[PDB]
Amino acid sequence: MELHCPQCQHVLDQDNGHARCRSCGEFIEMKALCPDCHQPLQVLKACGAVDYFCQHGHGLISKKRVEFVLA
Ligand SMILES: [Zn+2]
Ligand SMILES: [Zn+2]
């Protein structure tokens, strides 16, 4: 069933930190927050690989554990 929009109610096509409205046309970007912080994660860019570091003192957070909010 996936996630639906709270406005242009349709399917949200979600990838890494990004959600494009399929069937809507709209483009949405999402923030990667640490669940235990609610502050943004440090996007560690290694060109090919990207790590999400909890800038605060918790360690590394995977994109399957991160909390994505509407940006
Ligand atoms: Zn939509
Ligand atoms: Zn944290």
Per-residue 3-state assignment (H helix, E strand, C coil) for 30-56: EEEECCCCCCECEEEEECCEEEEEECC
Q: Which ligand is nearest to the CA of 21?
A: 1
Residue in the block written with tokens 């554990």:
65
Q: 31 CA distance to ligand 1 centroid (A)?
A: 17
Query: Could you state, in order of their start, the residue ranges of all structural domains in the chain?
Result: 1-71
Closest CA to 31 of 4, 67, 56: 67
Q: 18 CA distance to ligand 2 centroid (A)?
A: 21
Q: Which ligand is nearest to the CA of 61?
A: 2
Element (H, E) at 13: strand 12-15
Angle (CA) 60-52-63 rounded to 5° is: 95
| Angstrom distance (rounded) from CA 15 to CA 48 | 16
Q: 23 CA distance to ligand 1 centroid (A)?
A: 7
Please count the helices (runs of H) and the strands (runs of E) in the chain. Answer: 0, 7
Domain 1-71 has CATH 2.10.290.10: yes
